[model samples]
Target: MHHHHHHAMEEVTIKANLIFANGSTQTAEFKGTFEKATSEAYAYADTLKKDNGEWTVDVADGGYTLNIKFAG
Candidate 1:
């Protein structure tokens, strides 16, 4: 016989450190309703962990700015 497992989605909070190009840093957290059924987001966060706390996000007119940070 074979068995299967299932999990439901839940809200979560992720904490990390943000690094800036100006040589400054800040601790941050992201909260939202996320499904525990996916590893893609976790995998991506792991990738960011290898970036030495470096990350980026684009804003309107601001374009691509390296003002985001992620803690490993």
Candidate 2:
């Protein structure tokens, strides 16, 4: 059945506006529990490069910072 109920931690997806040092923006999507959305968002951003861009953290800082866009 494709209809189940009763859940403790449901899966969620969020989109983040990844900003690069080169002044480029990207829409990065992440998944995780709603409670850990923030954590997941940041974690997703960490896997980027100055050129790849996203919330950055290269060998001691290079380029990255996610400008999260929430659905309004």
Candidate 3:
């Protein structure tokens, strides 16, 4: 038998002057400047592997929403 799981994420935008994940002098996706965005981080993950030829992985239906805001 095998097991599986799922996660949910939302969309949230941040300010253009938001602090990005990029360098202090650069900006990229994770560190880009957006006037407004609806981005969300999947607050769920499923890791299944076989220890001895067996499958095992499960998750709950209730997950978390990864949203954040920043400026730099």
Candidate 4:
């Protein structure tokens, strides 16, 4: 019997941007482990909201890229 008790380190970069109704934009970026970087980016975005706006979150690396958009 064998136990898989090891985990691989996964690195990712997270970029978040917000586009306001006035066509203004703000961007935030971070890099770290997938969970940490993504989480930090989300928290950062939450702090940057001043009003209803369109926003996007992206994660990328050598493997693949993920994009998520939200309209407000």
Candidate 5:
């Protein structure tokens, strides 16, 4: 026998800023848990990866602001 409970998982908003190597920057937002948010942050960064420098993810303590910078 098994029991099932239905509930809603609270979602948080994580703001990410991508600074490219070509002197270009972008703003993106993600919604989910801490892990999910950061996961998507890096994922998105990868999608926007350039042929120059690499990417670095800098998030706030509360996992609020994600600074995804691409530089050496």
Candidate 6:
């Protein structure tokens, strides 16, 4: 099943950090914000479980930014 997230913001960047029980980790970086329900924006069950991910909204260097932990 796919999940949907409603975001009011217009700018966002999605990044995935995959971590295993053995302490291995990898990062997947993406551009743009996701406000609509799409296959690319959604994460799979195993991907969300094996790899912890995050999504950040564009913001100034000294300003506040929005961050979301990926979950399926």
TM-score of each: 0.33, 0.46, 0.15, 0.52, 0.70, 0.34
TM-score of 2: 0.46
Residue-wise C-alpha lDDT for candidate 2, range 17-41, written one tens digit per residue: 7555555557766666544654776
Q: Candidate 5 — which residues are off by over 4 angstroms?
A: 1-8, 50-52
lDDT of 1 by residue, 1-72 (tens): 222233355555444444555566764445443333123334444565565554554222221112244443
Look at candidate 5 and tell me the lDDT of residue 25. Answer: 80
Candidate 6: misplaced stretches above 4 Å?
1-11, 36-72
Per-residue accuracy of model 3 over 1-72 as CA lDDT, tens digit each: 223242244332322222223323222232212212213111111111121222222212222212222222
**Selected candidate, larger lDDT, 1 vs 6:** 1
Query: Over the stretch 1-72, how does candidate 5's per-residue lDDT look in tens digits?
Result: 223232346476779977877778878998876567768877887876666467887766456788888883
lDDT for each candidate structure: 0.42, 0.49, 0.22, 0.57, 0.72, 0.40
Candidate 4 — which pairs collide? none
Best by lDDT: 5
Q: In candidate 6, which residue pairs get closer than 3 Å at backbone N, Cα or C atoms, i.e. clash?
A: none
**Clashing pairs in model 3?**
11-38, 12-37, 12-38, 12-39, 13-37, 13-38, 16-34, 19-71, 20-31, 21-31
In model 2, the worst 10-residue window by lDDT is: 56-65
Cα displacement (angstroms), candidate 1, residue 15, comes to 1.8
Candidate with the larger TM-score of 2 and 6: 2
Q: Rank the candidates by lDDT, best first.
A: 5, 4, 2, 1, 6, 3
Instruction: Count steric clashes of candidate 2.
Output: 1
Mind sharing the TM-score for model 3? 0.15
lDDT of 4 by residue, 1-72 (tens): 322233347665666655555666666667877567767777766665545545565544431233434555
